A paper describes a structure:
Lipases are enzymes that reversibly catalyze the hydrolysis and synthesis of a large variety of glycerol esters. A minimal lid domain comprising the residues 141-183 is inserted between strand β6 and helix αE on top of the CD active-site area.
In this work, we determined the structure of the enzyme revealing a long-chain C18 monoacylglycerol (MAG) bound to the active site, which was taken up from its expression host. A single peak found in the elution diagram corresponded to the glycerol monostearate (2,3-dihydroxypropyloctadecanoate), suggesting that under the given sample preparation and crystallization conditions Tth MAG lipase products cannot be released. The resulting model, which was confirmed by an omit electron density map, supports the presence of a loosely coordinated tetrahedral MAG reaction intermediate, closely matching the geometry of covalently bound tetrahedral reaction mimics in a previously established MAG lipase12. The distal part of the C18 MAG reaction intermediate involving carbon atoms C11 to C18 is held by a hydrophobic tunnel across the Tth MAG lipase HBH lid domain, which is open at both ends. In conclusion, our structural data are strongly suggestive of the hydrophobic lid tunnel to be crucial for positioning long-chain MAG esters to allow efficient turnover by lipase hydrolysis.
Author numbering:
A (entry chain A), B (entry chain B): 1 to 259
The structure:
């Protein structure tokens, strides 16, 4: 079962998709997926859609929304900050918890790239009601990656205009000021339930070493990593995306279906 | 107004978005937008959503669906052919024609890249009921671009496997067999209503010369070209995207809001 859904708060409408298992009756586990920077809820080569349908096959529902300023949701990219996507995510969690078909004890979070940073922080904020966490190429170093651009041509334009063009998207100086005050590693530490990190070794956006840092600095024994050998940032191949999906589904199967 | 919509036919379910003006009610003009190859209804840097919202502002509604096999719609990419997207497009036009809010005399088509090839053929096939046509970087040379790979590494893989991996998408030999029989230039020739072609000079996917071929071989004086100087294939900058959308909205405003 796949059907479009809508969230509205503070005059903002978020547009998303919800999947529920056809066979199962009653309350089901739910995985919430957060997309990345300039991405949307379908994500690269439809990997989020494929992930939703793979979960549905094992009895696990899901929702995927576009953050405010991206995709089908309301707003322009220039209004978005990392913190405004955090507040979207809290509203998305609230939406899921309030669905009559949700098992509130079996809600999982999944995030890709900057969406992995969102997922890690929301997991920590709601550590007693998020059952499991999956991080795909999580951009915990997003603040550094943005600040590194301030000394390049982006920084000079930003100073003249208050925004920069990142390729058909208006990135506001508000985004830079907001993210420069955040430490994703610190804000994510303290989540004690099971974590799965999926990272490709040839990731040129979020270098593979970031997953080393997350295993070392953020989590304890509750986190394990699936390394996709030679894969790029979004697992852009049939074999790579299949490994990413299948490992994440089996992980969510283990953590959300029993206990 | 923006809302999710569905079409179910021949066991296939297509999923899309419909926009209606808020400030003008009753029967309104409608623009159907077709996305490109491996794209989806949001399209590159959300340009289709931005287009839908810019049309709303001038009193023009729109729909945009994911083709079967792409995005939010049903199906695997390996099930898709150019001809199956053409049949999708026929069902989308039927859907639009059957909405009570649609002015049946004021329906326009827009297509990007391979979606532009879809729009050109559909406009010609329904030439007496499509009031205006907008082509963005139209991939009328799609058959040649596919057959050009038959002598490259893709061709050798295709022969061994019956499909190729184009980056997390499975492209079937059925797609190759189907498109090798199609001449998009010939199938679009004869549409006599107004046409706008928008093309970037630095397009490296569909070379700008293709627009020269379309102006010469496909349409008469009813076609006009807007050249976006120095732009790439999907107008990936704020200024390029702004020009593409503004010129296309003013064209649809002139052609659909007449009389
Ligand atoms: C003070 C001026 C600052 C200007 C900053 C410009 C930044 C332009 C965007 C750079 C993004 C780089 C990192 C992308 C990382 C991966 C994200 C995923 O999701
Ligand atoms: C005999 C078959 C051999 C293999 C063919 C592989 C083709 C792989 C995809 C090639 C796409 C080329 C054009 C991309 C740009 C134009 C369309 C947009 O939309
Ligand atoms: C406009 C290009 C859309 C993606 C085409 C990909 C073809 C195979 C590239 C390796
Ligand atoms: C592959 C053909 C490209 C034609 C446009 C080139 C623009 C400068 C790179
Ligand atoms: C992982 C890349 C996301 C888009 C970045 C755009 C600015 C370089
Ligand atoms: C920008 C860092 C990239 C690290 C992986 C490089 C693989 C060729
Ligand atoms: Cl949608």
């Amino acid at each position: 079962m796949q059907k479009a859904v809508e969230i509205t708060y503070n005059g903002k409408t978020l547009r998303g998709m919800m999947h529920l298992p056809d066979d199962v009756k009653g309350k089901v586990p739910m995985v919430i997926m957060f997309h990345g920077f300039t991405g949307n809820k379908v994500e690269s080569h439809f990997i989020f859609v494929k992930m939703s349908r793979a979960l549905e096959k094992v009895g696990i529902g899901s929702v995927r929304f576009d953050f405010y300023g991206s995709g089908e949701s309301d707003g322009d990219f220039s209004e978005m900050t990392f913190s405004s996507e955090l507040e979207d995510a809290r509203q998305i969690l609230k939406f899921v918890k309030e669905q009559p078909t949700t098992d509130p004890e079996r809600i999982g979070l999944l995030g890709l790239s900057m969406g992995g940073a969102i997922a890690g922080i929301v997991a920590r904020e709601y550590k007693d009601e998020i059952k499991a966490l999956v991080l795909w190429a999580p951009a915990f170093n997003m603040p550094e990656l943005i600040m590194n651009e301030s000394v390049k041509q982006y920084g000079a334009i930003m100073e003249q205009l208050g925004f920069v063009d990142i390729g058909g998207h208006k990135l506001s100086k508000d985004f830079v000021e907001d993210i420069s005050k955040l430490n994703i590693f610190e804000l994510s530490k303290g989540y004690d339930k099971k974590v799965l990190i999926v990272h490709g070794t040839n990731d040129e956006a979020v270098e593979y070493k970031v997953s080393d840092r997350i295993l070392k600095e953020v989590y304890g024994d509750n986190a394990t990593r699936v390394t996709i050998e030679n894969a790029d940032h979004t697992f852009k191949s049939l074999e790579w995306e299949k490994k990413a999906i299948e490992e994440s589904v089996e992980f969510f199967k283990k953590e959300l279906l029993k206990g």
